[PDB]
């Protein structure tokens, strides 16, 4: 499949209460594989996956110093923005960045990108053509004009088309086994009619990974996806997730109701009724 | 060393063309190389720069670079040397990213004498 | 039409006497300000880069002890203590911290006398 390498960055100011908290988290095919947290005991770029340990400390030196550079720069950026937006010197604010490359199974680059947000709203972004920027508002327009004059995008292209891709197809080797793995769920229905006449039926899936799963209810043939109740997929802890779906039915009719559980770990979908 | 200027001095005639060597080391993916010159009164004037990811020898006025990535080398060519071209020439490079801030790393510099 | 103004321009001073230096930014599109030292054989070496007002810092080099303050968005200061040999101090400015060109002030020349 198409893999990606993405870095998520947060800088969040906390006036009076210390120094801007800084964070870089890295994902490969969308699982956390490195982190830096200005707030940890002895800040440093720690591996977040066992397979990253197979990396020599010369690598943990560079990344760490980079982050301290970056951290210090976002310190300054948080300040710049106060003057662009005319905001007051003592409120809290947030800058976030997403950067990465997306690579085909054939290894060719599909999409390089980099997007910035201030206080949860898109601020500036690099366009698909990898040469120009789209600014979301009047402050980002300053940033953008500034970045054009400095040819900042050619530097970004180079990183996105070179380093990023080359380091992607390298974390992929050392991380594969752990990454393109998977684990099947296990279900069970449950009756939870609080001493009443109506009978709501609930389907429980657990133990599964990845979080891609789908559960449904049908009236044997036709689909009862109308009044079906289900909550967002949650993570359990060990590196696997859980989910449940539910729906109302006339008491007496209970075994005319089937649950369906789909997941790539399974060799066939799962089916179950009351136990 | 990170930035190296092997030659101490050069003496040449007016109207000649001089090359100043510089060789460098860095482990950065992207980097930037500069030449500055310093005059008798000690002012340090910027001359020309070369970005590593840019695939063409920079040039400005009679100053031009001979940029040779594989050889970690970045010569400064002055064509048609003038008397006022006489100074010390500094080769510099941006000193690897990390807390530090605005770090230029300099070589020891080269004296250029242009004889009338 | 220069970006930076540096004072004082020189100083004659016995071994060890403290000296203060100050640099004023004239163009605020280059707010990244650094101090560089050139020693008596002309070797330039970086000392500090101070972006924000209130940024304070110390750095001991062979022959001198430094303390630097970004005082306001245009004023950068330098304390040189314990100076045992002369050297000259250059203020610089640049438009950002990655890759932009550094431009040099005229230097404050220190002479142990």
């Amino acid at each position: 499949g198409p893999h990606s390498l993405r870095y998520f960055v947060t800088a969040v100011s906390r006036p009076g209460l210390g120094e801007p908290r800084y964070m870089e988290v890295g994902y490969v095919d969308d699982t956390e594989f490195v982190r830096f947290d200005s707030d940890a005991e002895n800040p440093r770029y720690e591996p977040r996956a066992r397979w990253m340990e197979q990396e020599g400390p010369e690598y943990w030196e560079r990344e760490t110093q980079k982050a301290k550079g970056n951290e210090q720069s976002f310190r300054v950026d948080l300040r710049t923005l106060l003057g662009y937006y005319n905001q007051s010197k003592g409120g809290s604010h947030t800058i976030q960045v997403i950067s990465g490359c997306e690579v085909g199974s054939d290894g060719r680059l599909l999409r390089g990108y980099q997007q910035y947000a201030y206080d949860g709203c898109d601020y500036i972004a690099l366009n698909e053509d990898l040469k120009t920027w789209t600014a979301a508002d009047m402050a980002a327009l300053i940033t953008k004009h500034k970045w054009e004059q400095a040819g900042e995008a050619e530097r970004l292209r180079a990183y996105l088309e070179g380093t990023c891709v080359e380091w992607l197809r390298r974390y992929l080797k050392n991380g594969n086994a752990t990454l393109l793995r998977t684990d099947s769920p296990k279900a069970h229905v449950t009756h939870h009619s609080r001493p009443e006449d109506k009978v709501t039926l609930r389907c429980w899936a657990l133990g599964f990974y990845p979080a891609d799963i789908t559960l449904t209810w049908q009236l044997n043939g036709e689909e009862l996806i109308q009044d079906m109740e289900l909550v967002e997929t949650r993570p359990a802890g060990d590196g696997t997730f859980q989910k449940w779906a539910s729906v109302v039915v006339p008491l007496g009719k209970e075994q005319y109701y089937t649950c369906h559980v789909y997941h790539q770990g399974l060799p066939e979908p799962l089916t179950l009724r009351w136990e | 060393q990170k930035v190296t200027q092997t030659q101490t001095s050069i003496s040449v005639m007016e109207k000649t063309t001089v090359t100043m060597d510089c060789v460098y080391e860095t482990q950065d993916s992207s980097y930037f190389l500069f030449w500055y010159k310093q005059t008798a009164s000690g002012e340090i004037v910027f001359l020309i720069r070369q970005d590593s990811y840019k695939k063409e020898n920079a040039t400005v006025g009679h100053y031009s670079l001979n940029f040779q990535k594989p050889k970690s080398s970045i010569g400064l060519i002055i064509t048609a040397t003038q008397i006022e071209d006489s100074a010390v020439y500094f080769c510099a490079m941006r000193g690897d990213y990390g807390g530090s801030g605005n770090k230029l790393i300099f070589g020891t510099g080269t004296l250029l004498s242009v004889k009338p | 039409v220069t970006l930076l103004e540096q004072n004082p321009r020189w100083r004659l001073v016995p071994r060890g006497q403290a000296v203060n230096l100050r640099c004023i930014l004239k163009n605020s599109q280059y707010p990244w300000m650094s101090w560089y030292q050139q020693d008596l054989q002309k070797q330039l070496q970086w000392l500090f880069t101070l972006r924000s007002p209130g940024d304070k810092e110390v750095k001991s080099l062979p022959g001198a002890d430094y303390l630097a303050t970004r005082v306001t968005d245009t004023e950068l200061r330098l304390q040189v203590a314990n100076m045992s040999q002369g050297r000259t101090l250059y203020c610089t400015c640049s438009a950002d911290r990655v890759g932009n060109t550094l431009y040099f002030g005229e230097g404050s020349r220190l002479i142990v006398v």
Partner: peptide
């Protein structure tokens, strides 16, 4: 590896 961010 990550990137070295330009200033805003």
């Amino acid at each position: 590896r990550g990137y070295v961010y330009q200033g805003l």
